[PDB]
Symmetry: C4
Subunit: 82 residues, 4 copies
């Protein structure tokens, strides 16, 4: 699967995660984007996290949808530049 | 090993982790499920975590039982859909 | 490299991490063991973390020594049982 | 790609992350180094994290630049010594 296709999937995941967190949890766009990266990279600082049942479910789906996508994208990125 | 077999193993891990956290730590079913995903994906926000010696041991076993299972499942999921 | 050799390396890493955290940071043996697993699996809840400069350095070495060892051990464990 | 080349890339990532966190977030050099390792290993305790919009953006770039680099370095390190 081409690296650029994976990148597009990662972009869609970022949109999904950011919009989801902002509207379900009510955080700013900037915090939501930052939380999305932190979550899909599996860093998970816990400075931000869902506080509602829907936010928690949503976060599980994001984890399922995003962690593999992101992992493959970074390693393809690594190959590409190096 | 077939992707669906791995999925079943991941499901059993989720049951194990959720029930374990709920009964050992006393959190709600919903929090326990969410904590299980967050732990086996290695996100680990720390909004929830074990507060007893048995919960801590249990979490170590979950980590050992769940992180590999979950990693293989997501990457097999990725292959399957893409 | 044989799976059992890797297991022994993981055991040594666990001893290293546990003893280190207990004596440098002053946490209980049980907390230190739990923190070691949580760190080398990269879960990192942040319920426990080093609060001194030596603890922070030590944690960086543990991260370097432990995360690869642990990752290979779990995947070898997965292959072995499945 | 030679292991030593990867090591150099990891070193540059560490400089990038440490200096960035220290100057953008204002933490000590020691905390910033420790935070950099904790972030690029994806441990993410959350004892330290960015509190400004620029720090959050910067952390996303560090995550993108550092997690793949670091993962490949540790596994190459593992092969080399074992
Ligand atoms: Na974390
Ligand atoms: Na945390
Ligand atoms: Na992680
Ligand atoms: Na983590």
């Amino acid at each position: 699967v081409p690296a650029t296709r994976i990148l597009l999937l990662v972009l869609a995941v970022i949109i999904y995660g950011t919009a989801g967190f902002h509207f379900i949890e009510g955080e700013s766009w900037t915090v939501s984007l930052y939380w999305t990266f932190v979550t899909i990279a599996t860093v998970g600082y816990g400075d931000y996290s869902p506080h509602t049942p829907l936010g928690m479910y949503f976060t599980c789906t994001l984890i399922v949808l995003g962690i593999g996508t992101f992992a493959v994208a970074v390693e393809r990125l690594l190959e590409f530049l190096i």
